[PDB]
Design a protein around this nucleic acid. Structure first.
Ligand SMILES: [Mg+2]
Ligand SMILES: [Mg+2]
Ligand SMILES: [Zn+2]
Lengths: 175, 128, 293, 203
RNA sequence: AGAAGCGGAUUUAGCUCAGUUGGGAGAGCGCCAGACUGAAGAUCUGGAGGUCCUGUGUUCGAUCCACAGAAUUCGCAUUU
RNA sequence: UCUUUACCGACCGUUGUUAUCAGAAAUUCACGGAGUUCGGCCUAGGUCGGACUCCGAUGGGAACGGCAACGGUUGUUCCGUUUGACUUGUCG
């Protein structure tokens, strides 16, 4: 006979607050410009995809770019989709973490729409890292990023004790 | 299939043990971060010690942890991987995360998406 | 410092009620022990093994150190401890020892038969072993058992006040005490005064002469009242207030606060001791480099 | 070089606590060469003239808030110390203190067999089996302090959130428990002969 | 109060004693309470009650296994 | 646990165990992916079989690692003493 037993297991007490994805609102004003720009990149020539706009869409190149090889470009922006199925959780639990230790001004934007499976199915993987050094796009990227899309860290900034979190899991035991 | 019994009387000894484990994890993580933000690796063999002692206490009272903790900490030297060496992907395998000591913790990511751990599934978990 | 740890309480059964005359008599004999000179007093209470014990928490203590002896303390300047001598005769009826032990400070025993004497030294967590010096000794003590019991802890206790009761009892008293000194190897000997009156009190230099004439040396007698007496107080005092000699609720000041010496500064309600902010991690370094204290 | 040190965490911890003592001795030598008694001028002097020597020096000013607040808040949560103090239970609290780890505690040597060990306050970086490791500041001294536990009495204050009204002070004895924290998680402490504790009555 | 030396057995709730692939800490009696009786015993139900002699170490985890330190107790053609 | 001037090293084999859950798997059962080599159909190199190597979220864990018992050593097992001196009795 099978009996269900609840076992107490210690949770990471701050992983919910470490994965508090930033507050994004009035976001359909942004996907129009972003998707139109990405399509206009991806139409003509694979060299002309990355020749006027330098962007990296492979996670190994994201790690090698944020390691410290290129230090000139200080404003560098990232776009990562959450709340979207068919997206790996192994990278997604480490993407907002690796950008924190980067000395460059890296600006993560979490895309909140679940229906946005287009950018993953089209370009590479569903993430986008590019540079706003002298491009035209920064002329609106600096406009809205101060409004709603602010990214700051409250969790490591001040000194604060954290309460413990002990959860409990299901276990089916046959006897 | 069987009998459905949900007890919320948590036991005092298990709460003491998991508070001890969580305090060791918090003090090791905060030592590591307070050292890492300011300057170079000063007392990186110190905080690791706590984690090792933590894992040994996890060997004593038969306790299990979430895969977030064991994914954070190492396996052999048992150190925190908040600052790892290198992260590589699609290098003819799935994924690789290198460390300073040389012990790697890889994950099968090139097979298929939408795979979750047993503690991360929709209904298997009840908080507090 | 001197310890007198076997002053009896005028009550044997819980059904009996102590009159005010016996309480005033105990006040007068405590004033007598304060008059010539002593440092510590641990008053004793007799408990039989087969009585009907109450299932209470705040009623297991008919001593009341706080209300009457707390008033006697301010004019006295001494302290009182409470203890139980377990009058254990047969392995027939017992008790819940975890309540009777944690009730008072010191736990003692009084054997009458063979097997009880063995299970007291073996399993029963007590502080002192007292024998019936007034009546016939239960058995004659083996050396390797008493030696192992002293090496485990518990020491033997000699009551020199029981010889002051009757004429016939002196012969049985000396016949018991010489056997205790013979089989105890002069390690675990703690002496105490079993007086019920202030009219049977003695001075240190007469009790030392009594221990001389019984058979034990003089320096070992004063060492038994300095070293051996105050340590077996601390044993039960740490066992019953704190954990099993592990983590103590007693404040470690310089020379005034102690687990033994500072009883009133510890809240005897449950465990705690209210101490003001004497430890600051901000601007306190080495002790010889401070300037504020 | 870096891989051979951290192969064992205990040996690298020993190398770190040796390097801190050697750097403290070098700091005392450079301080007597400096002839300045102020430590705030001494740290800037080391920052100006000795960059590689400054790298392994401890920071006690950083060490106090990163440890004391977490330790006090953990004890206020664990022992159920709240604004309501009249519902306290002391025996279960002492059992929890027997079960709680003292890694990260502020602790003071109040009584000892050695007359020079007393008066030392310090915060735990690691618990040994039979010794104890703290850190204390002097005028210019920042040495990692090793203190024996066999024959010493330690005390620690548990504050209450009210200001200057009430606070608690507890005491442990390192000669009583002489084991690792790992064994102390499972050990049920029992009685001892306690014959060698005469010093606690002596001084 | 009848040693000294030798072999065997053995310590677990107040008591008498089980028990152990090594993963739960127990039974009888006693205490308290319920049930029952005009009352009580007996019968029956439930609860309270632990230093598994102590310590090391092995192991992921000890009443159990290894070592160390104590001892309990029988026998030596006996009832002293 | 081992080795000893090892001018080459050598952790013996078998049996059982590591409870529940987890995981593909609690003992080199098996399963999934990648690389190499060989053979058959076949020849823009597609598929199939066999062998090796590496990896796969879980748990102290995949490490022929830890624990307990037994022996092939010059065949195993059983039985008996090689231990006494005075006194007494018998026999020559
Ligand atoms: Mg002999
Ligand atoms: Mg001998
Ligand atoms: Zn590592």
């Amino acid at each position: 006979k099978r009996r269900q037993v609840y076992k107490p297991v210690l949770d990471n007490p701050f992983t919910n607050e470490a994965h508090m994805w930033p507050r994004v609102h009035d976001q359909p004003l942004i996907w129009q410009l972003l998707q139109s720009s990405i399509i206009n990149k991806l139409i003509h020539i694979q060299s002309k995809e990355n020749y006027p706009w330098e962007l990296y869409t492979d996670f190994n190149e994201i790690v090698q770019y944020l390691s410290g090889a290129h230090g000139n470009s200080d404003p560098v922006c990232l776009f990562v989709c959450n709340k979207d199925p068919d997206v790996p959780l192994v990278l997604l639990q480490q993407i907002p973490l690796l950008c924190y230790m980067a000395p460059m001004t890296v600006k993560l934007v979490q895309l909140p729409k679940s229906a946005m499976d287009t950018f993953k199915s089209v370009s590479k993987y569903g993430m986008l890292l590019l540079r706003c050094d002298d491009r035209v796009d920064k002329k609106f990227v600096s406009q809205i990023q101060k409004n709603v899309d602010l990214l700051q860290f409250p969790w490591l900034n001040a000194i604060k004790y954290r309460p413990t979190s002990v959860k409990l899991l299901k276990t089916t035991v046959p006897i | 299939n069987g009998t459905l019994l949900v007890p919320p009387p948590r036991t005092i000894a298990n709460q003491d043990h998991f508070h001890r484990l969580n305090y060791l994890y918090q003090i090791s993580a905060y030592q590591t971060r307070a050292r890492q933000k300011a300057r170079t690796d000063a007392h990186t063999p110190l905080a690791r010690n706590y984690i090792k002692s933590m894992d040994l206490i996890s060997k004593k009272t038969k306790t299990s942890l979430l895969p977030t903790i064991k994914r954070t900490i190492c396996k052999k030297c048992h150190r925190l991987l908040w600052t790892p060496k290198k992260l590589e992907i699609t290098s003819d395998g799935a994924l690789s995360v290198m460390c300073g000591c040389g012990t790697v913790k890889r994950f099968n990511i090139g097979a298929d998406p939408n795979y979750r751990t047993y503690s991360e599934r929709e209904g298997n978990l009840l908080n507090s | 410092m001197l310890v007198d740890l076997n002053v009896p309480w005028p009550q044997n059964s819980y059904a009996d009620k102590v009159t005010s005359q016996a309480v005033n008599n105990l006040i007068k004999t405590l004033s007598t022990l304060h008059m010539l000179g002593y440092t510590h007093i641990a008053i004793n209470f007799t408990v039989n093994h087969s009585e009907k014990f109450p299932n209470d928490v705040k009623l297991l203590n008919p001593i009341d150190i706080k209300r009457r002896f707390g008033e006697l303390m301010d004019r006295t300047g001494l302290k009182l401890y409470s203890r139980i001598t377990l009058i254990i005769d047969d392995p027939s009826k017992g008790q819940s020892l975890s309540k009777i032990s944690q009730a008072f400070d010191i736990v003692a025993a009084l054997p009458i038969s063979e097997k009880g004497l063995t299970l007291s030294t073996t399993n029963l967590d007590i502080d002192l072993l007292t024998f019936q010096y007034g009546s016939r000794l239960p058995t004659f003590l083996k050396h390797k058992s008493i030696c192992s019991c002293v090496n485990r802890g518990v020491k033997l206790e000699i009551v020199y006040g029981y010889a002051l009761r009757d004429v016939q009892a002196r012969r049985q008293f000396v016949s018991n005490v010489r056997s205790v000194i013979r089989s105890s190897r002069s390690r675990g000997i703690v002496i105490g005064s079993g007086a019920m009156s202030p009219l049977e009190c003695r001075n240190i230099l007469g009790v030392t002469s009594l221990i001389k004439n019984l058979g034990l040396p003089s320096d070992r007698c004063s060492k038994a009242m300095g070293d051996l007496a105050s340590l077996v107080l601390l044993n039960g005092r740490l066992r019953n207030k704190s954990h099993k000699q592990t983590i103590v609720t007693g404040g470690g000041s310089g020379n005034g606060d102690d687990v033994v010496n500072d009883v009133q500064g510890i809240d005897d309600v449950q465990t705690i001791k209210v101490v003001k902010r004497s430890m600051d991690a901000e601007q306190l370094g080495h002790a010889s480099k401070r300037h504020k204290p | 070089d870096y891989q051979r040190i951290n192969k064992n965490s205990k040996i690298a911890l020993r190398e770190y606590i040796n390097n801190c003592k050697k750097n403290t001795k070098k700091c005392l030598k450079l301080a007597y060469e400096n002839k300045i008694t102020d430590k705030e001028d001494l740290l800037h002097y080391i920052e100006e003239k000795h960059p590689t020597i400054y790298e392994s020096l401890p920071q006690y000013v950083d060490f106090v808030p990163m440890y004391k607040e977490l330790w006090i808040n953990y004890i206020k949560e664990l022992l159920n110390i709240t604004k309501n103090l009249k519902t306290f239970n002391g025996s279960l609290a002492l059992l929890k203190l027997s079960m709680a780890d003292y890694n990260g505690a502020l602790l003071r040597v109040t009584k000892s067999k050695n007359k020079t060990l007393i008066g030392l306050q310090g915060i735990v970086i690691w618990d040994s089996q039979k010794f104890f490791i703290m850190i204390v500041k002097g005028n210019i001294i920042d040495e990692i302090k090793c203190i024996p536990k066999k024959g010493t009495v330690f005390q620690f204050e548990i504050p209450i959130s009210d200001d200057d009204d009430s606070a608690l002070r507890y005491s442990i004895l390192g000669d009583r428990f002489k084991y690792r924290s790992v064994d102390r998680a499972g050990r049920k402490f029992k009685s001892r002969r306690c014959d060698d504790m005469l010093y606690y009555i002596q001084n």
